[PDB]
Amino acid sequence: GSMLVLITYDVQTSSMGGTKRLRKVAKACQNYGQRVQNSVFECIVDSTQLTSLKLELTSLIDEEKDSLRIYRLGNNYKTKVEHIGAKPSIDLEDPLIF
Amino acid sequence: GSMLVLITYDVQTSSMGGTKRLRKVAKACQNYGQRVQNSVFECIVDSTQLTSLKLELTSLIDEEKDSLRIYRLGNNYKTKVEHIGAKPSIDLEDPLIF
Amino acid sequence: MKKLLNTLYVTQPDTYLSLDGDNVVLLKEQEKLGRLPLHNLEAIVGFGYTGASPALMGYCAERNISITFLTKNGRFLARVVGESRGNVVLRKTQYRISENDQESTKIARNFITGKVYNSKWMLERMTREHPLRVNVEQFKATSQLLSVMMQEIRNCDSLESLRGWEGQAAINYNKVFDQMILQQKEEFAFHGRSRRPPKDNVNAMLSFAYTLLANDVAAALETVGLDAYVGFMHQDRPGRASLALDLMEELRGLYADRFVLSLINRKEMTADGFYKKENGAVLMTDEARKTFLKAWQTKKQEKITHPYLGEKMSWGLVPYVQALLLARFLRGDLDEYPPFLW
Amino acid sequence: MKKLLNTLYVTQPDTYLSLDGDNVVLLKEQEKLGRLPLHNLEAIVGFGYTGASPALMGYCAERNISITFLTKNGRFLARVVGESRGNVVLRKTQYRISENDQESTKIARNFITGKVYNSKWMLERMTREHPLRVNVEQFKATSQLLSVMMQEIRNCDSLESLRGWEGQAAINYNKVFDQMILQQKEEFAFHGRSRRPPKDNVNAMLSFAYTLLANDVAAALETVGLDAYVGFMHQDRPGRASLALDLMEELRGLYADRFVLSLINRKEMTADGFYKKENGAVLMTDEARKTFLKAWQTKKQEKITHPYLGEKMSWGLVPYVQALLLARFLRGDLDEYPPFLWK
Amino acid sequence: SNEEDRYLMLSGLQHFQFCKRQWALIHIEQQWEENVRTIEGQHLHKKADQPFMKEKRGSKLTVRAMPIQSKNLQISGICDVVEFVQDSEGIELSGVSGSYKAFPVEYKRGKPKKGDEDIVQLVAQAMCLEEMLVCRIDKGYLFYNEIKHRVEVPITDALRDKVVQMAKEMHHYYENRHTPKVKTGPFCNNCSLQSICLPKLMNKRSVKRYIEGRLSE
DNA sequence: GTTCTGGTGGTCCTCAGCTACGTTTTTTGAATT
DNA sequence: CGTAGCTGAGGACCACCAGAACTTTTTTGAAT
Ligand SMILES: [Mn+2]
C-alpha cells in the first residue's frame, strides 16, 4: 500500500539489561526506517513489512518495563506532516539526485 | 472537529538558554494534551486550538537550533493507534470515571 | 500488481557505497553523506568513479536490485549480474523456442506490430491535436502506408524478411521526426533522428534515454527469471545489446522519443545546458543532467491505465508487466505474446 | 596465485586489488604485497572480505574481463561485467549437449571412470597402509572387479547401461567402507545405508559432508559461467543442481569419505556430541557441528599437487580449477575432461 | 538406487486442495511470495519448531518435528507433533518394550474450513505412520490458533482412497511439468501469488480479438 | 494555593573507540470468512 | 569490509526543592 507510519519507543535502561535492549531495538528499527528525532522514527511500509517489523520488535522489548507506540497516517501523508525546526529529513518521493 | 494531534519536540540544551526553552516548551505543550513518552505529546483538539498551539510554539522556540514536528491522525484515531508496552494513556472519549 | 520503487542516482565522484544491516550508506573520505533503507529502493545508478563493497553487491544481487556504473554522460559500464535461482523449465523453454524459425517469426511479428502501431498512432495523435503548426496531408499519407505494412507484418514467416521491413519502418519515419519540433528550432540544432556515436548536439538526451531504458528493461527481465538481450528474437551478432531494446521497441519509439520531444517543446531545457568539446563531441552540464533526471522521474511517477483490464498502473511498471506476460506465454497460458498498443 | 589457466585466484583475505598502468597490484594493508601484468588475463576471482579499486573495475570491464567476488568460505557473492562475454555461447552449448544423449553419455562415463579410479586406488592405498587386521584377498578381488567395471564403463554407450553398471560398484564400495574403519569400530557402525531420515550415526557425517561438497561444487559451477541446474547424467528436476551432483559423484571419494574416516580415526570426534531421537537420525550438537566445520576448513587449507597441471595448490581450489577445464572442453579447446586419470 | 529423488513433500498436499494452480506455482516454478497472513503463520511455525530437545512430560510423549517418509504413496516430509500414549493394545516402538499409540497433531492458523484443505495433510501423515508399521489408527487431532481449539478427526477408507488417488494424480501432473488453469472465484483475492498467478487470464477475449480490434481501428 | 526562576540528581539515548571473528543440510507457510 | 560484544563521553528529558511575588483603562479581530 506504500503508507507512512511512525514508531516511538521508550526502553528503561536502568534494568538489568536495558542498554543491550536499547541497542538491539534501535538497530532493528533503523533497518526498516529513517530516523527523524531521538527515539522517533518514520518510514514508508506496506502491510507485510509493518507486520514483519511488529513481530520482530515485539520480541526484543520486555513488557512491564518498556513502551512502544506505532501510528499510521495513510496514503495522503504529504498533508498531515509539518516540520518547523532545523532537523530536515530526506523525502522518499524525491528523485534522490545525490 | 476533535481530531487527534501528536507533537514531538527536540530542543538543544547545550546552547545558552536551552533549559529555559525546554521548560517553556514542556509547559506550553502540557496545557493541551497528555504525555505518552518523553518529548512526545498527544491531544484531542479542534482546528482553532491547533492553530493557537502552533502559533504559540512557533513564537516560543528559536530557529536554526530546535526541532518541532506536528502530525494529525484525523477523526478516525481509534483504529490507527497501537500500543504494546506498559505505559497506558488515558482516553478522553470514554465515560472517564475517576 | 507490484508497486514501483524509487531509484538512487549517484552523481558525485570519488564516493563509496557500504552496507549496514538493510541500509545503503554513502561515504566520501570517512564522512557519512547519507543512508537510505534498501527495502524501498529498486536500482542504484552511479556516475564517475564510484566503488561498492562486495557485501552490498551480493545483497543487491540476491534481493533483485540492479547496480550500474556510468561515465560522465551515461556510458554503460560494468553492470552487476547475479546468480541462477532455479525455474529450470522456464529457462529451458526460452532457450528451446530460440534456434527455431516458426515461433521466432511469430513473436517478431508481434513485436514489430506493436512498434509500428505505436509509432503510427503517436504521429496520428500529434497531427490530430495541432493541425496548424505542421503539414497534415503528408502525415496522413505516411500513416496510411504504415497501415499496409501492418497487414504484411502479420503475413510473414521468416526472420530474414522482417529485418528488411524494419529498414523500411526506419526510413519511412525519419523524415517525419525532423518536422516534429515546434519551438527552439534555431537554438537546438535539430537534424531529425540522425545519430553519431561522437554525438552532434540534440542527441545527448536521446542517447541517455536509450541507455536508461536498456538498463531498466534488462533489470526487469532479469527479475522474472529470463534473459532477453541476445536470444530468440534479435540478431546473433555479438555486441548488439538490442533485444533488451527490441522488447521495448514498442516503447523506445514512444516512451523515450516522446519524453525528449516534450522536453524540447515545453521550454524545459535551454540551449545553455549543452556545450561542445574540442574534438567536436557534445556534453551536458551537471545542472542540465540533474534537470533531465528530475523530469524523467516525474514522468515515471504519474499513472496510466493498461488496455487489457483497465487497472491503474505506472509508467515504470510498463516494462516489468510486458516481461511478466512474456513469461506466461512461455507457459502456454496465452496464444502468443500480446504487445503494448496505444 | 596466477594459475597456468589464464585466471587469478587471489585467496588471502584482507587484501586490496588496485590498478597501476596496465598491471594489477595486491596491497596488504597499505604495503605493496604483489604485482602482476594484466595482458594475458581472461578472468579474475577474488576470495575473502576484500574489495577492488574503481579504476581497476573500469579497466577490466571494458576489455572483456569479468570480475567475480566471493566470500572467504566459498559462497558466491557477485559478478561484475559489462556486455557479457564467453557466457552465452557456453550456456548454449551446455543445454544443446544436455538435450542430446550421446555427448551426455560420454561425459557421464568419463565422470564414472574418474569415480571408480578414485575408489580403486583408495582401496589399494588402504590395503597397503595398514596390512595388519583387514581382509586382504577380499580387497584384491574387489580391486580386480572394479578394474573390469573400469573397462566396461570405458566401453559404455547409453544412459541406462551406464547407470546400471555404475550402481553395481556402489554396493561393493559400501561393504568395503563398512570394513574400512579401524579406530572406534566397536562403537561406530555402518551395517546399512539410508538417506532422507538418516538412520544411524555415520549416515549423518556422510550426509553433512555431502551437502557441504554440493554447495562448494555449485559455487564452482556458478563462478565459471556454466549452468548448475542443467546436468548431463542426472536428469532435470526443478530445484536440484544436476551438474553439481555430477561433479559431486565424481569427487565423492578422497574429498568426502576420507574426511569422515579421518574424523572417526585419530580420536578427533566422539559420541557425546551426537544424539538419537526416536528414528535413528543424528541431530548433531552445536559443538559437534562447530568442530566439523573447523575440521572441514582445516582440510581445505591443506596443500597438494594437481596430477594433471602439476602446479601446487590448496584443496579448496581443486573443484574450481576442475570446473574451468569443463568450460574449456565446452569451448572446443580440449578433447576430454580427465578429473583423475592417466589418459 | 535413488529412491529419494521421486519423493515429494507433505506441504504439497494442502496447496493441492485450494487453488490447484497454486501448488504448481510453488513446487514446479519454484516461486513464492509472502503477505500479511503468511508472516504470522511462519512466525508461529518457527516458535513451535523446537527440535534437538525432547520435551518429555510424564508417561506420554509429545515428540516434535518428526521426519516422515512413505513408499506406497511415495511422499516425504516432516510431521509437526506426535503424541505417544501408553496402551496395552498398541504396537511396540523400536528400542523400548511395550506398546504406545502414536496420535498425530498438526498446528495451523485459522478457523475450520469446509473444503477440507487441512484434513488431507493430517490423513497423509497418519497414513505414513501406519505404513511405517502397516497398522490401523482411527484417531487424529488438529489445532487452531486464533480460536485456540483442538478438534478430533477420525480417518476411514473414504479418506484413504482419496489421498492415494490424490498422490497418484499429483505425481502424474508433476511428471509432465504442467501447470493447470482453474476457476478463480472470490478466494483468489487472498492467495499469496496474485502478482504471479494472474487470475484474470481465464476470462479474456484472447489475442485474436485484439488483432481484429487493431484491424477495426 | 498558583506562577516563575534557579539549582541538582537521576535517567534515556546516540556516537566514537577497541577486540574478535565471519560456513549450517531440508521441509513448512494464508486463503470463500 | 561487516557483525557482534564491551566500554567511555557527553547532550536531552523530567522530577524535586527553595525563594519571591500575586491589581493596568479601552480598543481591534476572518469572510474561496
Ligand atoms: Mn503447523
Automatic annotation (TrEMBL), chain C:
GO terms for molecular function: DNA binding; DNA endonuclease activity; hydrolase activity; metal ion binding. One of its GO terms (biological process) is defense response to virus. Its cofactor is Mg(2+); Mn(2+). Mn(2+) binds at E166, H234, E249. CDD domains: Cas1_I-C. Gene3D superfamilies: CRISPR-associated endonuclease Cas1, C-terminal domain (1.20.120.920), CRISPR-associated endonuclease Cas1, N-terminal domain (3.100.10.20). It comes from the Bacteria. Keywords: Antiviral defense, DNA-binding, Endonuclease, Hydrolase, Magnesium, Manganese, Metal-binding, Nuclease. It is an enzyme of class 3 (hydrolase). Its EC number is 3.1.-.-. Pfam families: Cas_Cas1. NCBIfam families: cas1, cas1_DVULG. CRISPR (clustered regularly interspaced short palindromic repeat), is an adaptive immune system that provides protection against mobile genetic elements (viruses, transposable elements and conjugative plasmids). CRISPR clusters contain spacers, sequences complementary to antecedent mobile elements, and target invading nucleic acids. CRISPR clusters are transcribed and processed into CRISPR RNA (crRNA). Acts as a dsDNA endonuclease. Involved in the integration of spacer DNA into the CRISPR cassette. Belongs to the CRISPR-associated endonuclease Cas1 family. Homodimer, forms a heterotetramer with a Cas2 homodimer. This is CRISPR-associated endonuclease Cas1. It comes from Halalkalibacterium halodurans (strain ATCC BAA-125 / DSM 18197 / FERM 7344 / JCM 9153 / C-125) (Bacillus halodurans).
TrEMBL record, chain D:
Belongs to the CRISPR-associated endonuclease Cas1 family. Keywords: Antiviral defense, DNA-binding, Endonuclease, Hydrolase, Magnesium, Manganese, Metal-binding, Nuclease. One of its GO terms (molecular function) is metal ion binding. GO terms for biological process: defense response to virus; maintenance of CRISPR repeat elements. Gene3D superfamilies: CRISPR-associated endonuclease Cas1, C-terminal domain (1.20.120.920), CRISPR-associated endonuclease Cas1, N-terminal domain (3.100.10.20). Mn(2+) binds at E166, H234, E249. CDD domains: Cas1_I-C. The keyword Protein biosynthesis does not apply. PANTHER family: CRISPR-ASSOCIATED ENDONUCLEASE CAS1 1. It comes from Halalkalibacterium halodurans (strain ATCC BAA-125 / DSM 18197 / FERM 7344 / JCM 9153 / C-125). Its cofactor is Mg(2+); Mn(2+). CRISPR (clustered regularly interspaced short palindromic repeat), is an adaptive immune system that provides protection against mobile genetic elements (viruses, transposable elements and conjugative plasmids). CRISPR clusters contain spacers, sequences complementary to antecedent mobile elements, and target invading nucleic acids. CRISPR clusters are transcribed and processed into CRISPR RNA (crRNA). Acts as a dsDNA endonuclease. Involved in the integration of spacer DNA into the CRISPR cassette. This is CRISPR-associated endonuclease Cas1. Its EC number is 3.1.-.-.
